[PDB]
Amino acid sequence: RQVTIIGAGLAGTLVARLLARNGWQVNLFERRPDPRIETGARRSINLALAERGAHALRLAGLEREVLAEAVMMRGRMVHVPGTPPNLQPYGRDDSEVIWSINRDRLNRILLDGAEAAGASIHFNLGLDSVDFARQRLTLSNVSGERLEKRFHLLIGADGCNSAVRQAMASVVDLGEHLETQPHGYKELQITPEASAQFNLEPNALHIWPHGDYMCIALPNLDRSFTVTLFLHHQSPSPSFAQLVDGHAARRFFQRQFPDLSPMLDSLEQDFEHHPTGKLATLRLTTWHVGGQAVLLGDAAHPMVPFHGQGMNCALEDAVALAEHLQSAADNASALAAFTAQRQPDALAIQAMALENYVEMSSPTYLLERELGQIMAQRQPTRFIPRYSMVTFSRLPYAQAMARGQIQEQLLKFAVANHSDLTSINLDAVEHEVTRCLPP
Numbered sequence: 001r002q003v004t005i006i007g008a009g010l011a012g013t014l015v016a017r018l019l020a021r022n023g024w025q026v027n028l029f030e031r032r033p034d035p036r037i038e039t040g041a042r043r044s045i046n047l048a049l050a051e052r053g054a055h056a057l058r059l060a061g062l063e064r065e066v067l068a069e070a071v072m073m074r075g076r077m078v079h080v081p082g083t084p085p086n087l088q089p090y091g092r093d094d095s096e097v098i099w100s101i102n103r104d105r106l107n108r109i110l111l112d113g114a115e116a117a118g119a120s121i122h123f124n125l126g127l128d129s130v131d132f133a134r135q136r137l138t139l140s141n142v143s144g145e146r147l148e149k150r151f152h153l154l155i156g157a158d159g160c161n162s163a164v165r166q167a168m169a170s171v172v173d174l175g176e177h178l179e180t181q182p183h184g185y186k187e188l189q190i191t192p193e194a195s196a197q198f199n200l201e202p203n204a205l206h207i208w209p210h211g212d213y214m215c216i217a218l219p220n221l222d223r224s225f226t227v228t229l230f231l232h233h234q235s236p237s238p239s240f241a242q243l244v245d246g247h248a249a250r251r252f253f254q255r256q257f258p259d260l261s262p263m264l265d266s267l268e269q270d271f272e273h274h275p276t277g278k279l280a281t282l283r284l285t286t287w288h289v290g291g292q293a294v295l296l297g298d299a300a301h302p303m304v305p306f307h308g309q310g311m312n313c314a315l316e317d318a319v320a321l322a323e324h325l326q327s328a329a330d331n332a333s334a335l336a337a338f339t340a341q342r343q344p345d346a347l348a349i350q351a352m353a354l355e356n357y358v359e360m361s362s363p364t365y366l367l368e369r370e371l372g373q374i375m376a377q378r379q380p381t382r383f384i385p386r387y388s389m390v391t392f393s394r395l396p397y398a399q400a401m402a403r404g405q406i407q408e409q410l411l412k413f414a415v416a417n418h419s420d421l422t423s424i425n426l427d428a429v430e431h432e433v434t435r436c437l438p439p
């Protein structure tokens, strides 16, 4: 059984490994050069690995290797210029944590894993077009030289700007719905010396909320941090358009993030040399063309990054796609079944990711969460906070969102017209928890 995968990123490399070790003949094409071929060139991007992604790597036999290079994040460290930052633990103990991993290093581990299983990877070749009728595709290098290949099954794991998706959209209406996101983002750096000087906790995810914009920082093994600024592209107030150069960015940080600016030694340089990224939510009505082509990961469901679940979801997709392809009656049945299974969950995490921005960038909120804590301690089997369901369990995203709604409305009604917990009867709410939330 033969398969061609476009995109040696995260979902594409994992699915290549899962299929190759199950006896598939896998050819993987990547536009970029092989990152394992060391050059004289300078990437420090990292991201949050959670249970969904970790479990996928576990099935693939790669979790231990990945986690050996990951920094444990036990909770959120929220920074507001006046208050001292105190850790908000993510869960009960160190089993409920998030892992900060270098993106390039994760990709290199996955690349070795795909080749170890027997997949052939071809770099410096980007997909340009697909001829579905003749079952041929065209690739080219950066210099334009074109190369045609026959294909039997085409997997689009080629990112938020998928060329496979573009080619599919010409032979079928994919029912695309693009919801633009006003925030851009910029990557900045904190050195190991600066993070130590300012006593920045290494085993935590750091947030500098500020309403319509915010900063986060994730730790690295060498105690450096990668900082991400999230800020509106244009003003409808601060925006990227008002930050014309690095000196403008410095003044912006000194006023709005005074506690963080002194840690950003290379702010001016990083701001001018690192391009501003774009965010969006893109929903598709269908992800496949017959039994010929299918999308997964960011190619299928671009999402805003405010829940740190895009990679985790993409690796989850890879496991599911490989499972369906392995045991289906035929490729067409597999792709339809894969799409039917994962589409509702992708929509759920896309919606939860958008909702989560409000939860971070920022009364009744505190009393509700207090009661939620008591309910969790009374019925840890039934009342599980949505964040923990998304982050530390493998419950289908849509199921996690549905239970999260039941719980939010539960706490909202119980707290309504109550000044404090002393006036709330905790037994009747537990009764409602047992009534509406199975274990």
Ligand SMILES: Cc1cc2nc3c(=O)[nH]c(=O)nc-3n(C[C@H](O)[C@H](O)[C@H](O)COP(=O)(O)OP(=O)(O)OC[C@H]3O[C@@H](n4cnc5c(N)ncnc54)[C@H](O)[C@@H]3O)c2cc1C
Binding pocket: 006, 007, 008, 009, 010, 011, 012, 029, 030, 031, 032, 046, 047, 048, 049, 125, 126, 127, 128, 157, 158, 159, 160, 161, 162, 163, 185, 228, 277, 296, 297, 298, 299, 305, 307, 308, 309, 310, 311, 312, 313, 314
């Ligand atoms: C700022 C930011 C922060 C994020 N933080 C997190 C986080 O903390 N946790 C998390 O889980 N997710 C996070 N995400 C999301 C995560 O990065 C993506 O969801 C994930 O990388 C998607 O994996 P993928 O394999 O589908 O796509 P990618 O990882 O983008 O892989 C696509 C691959 O295809 C290649 N390619 C592209 N076009 C072509 C072509 N025409 N031909 C051949 N190859 C091609 C690319 O070079 C690349 O190697 C974040 C995203 C952003 C933007």
Ligand SMILES: Cc1cc2c(c(C)c1Cl)N(Cc1nnn[nH]1)C(=O)CO2
Binding pocket: 048, 076, 098, 205, 216, 305, 306, 307, 308, 309, 356, 360, 391
């Ligand atoms: C880029 C990114 C990555 C993440 C998270 C967030 C906000 C962002 Cl912006 N989150 C969600 C979260 N919510 N509250 N604390 N963490 C995580 O858990 C780690 O992955």
Ligand SMILES: [Cl-]
Binding pocket: 303, 304, 305, 306, 307, 308, 309, 310, 311
């Ligand atoms: Cl994300």
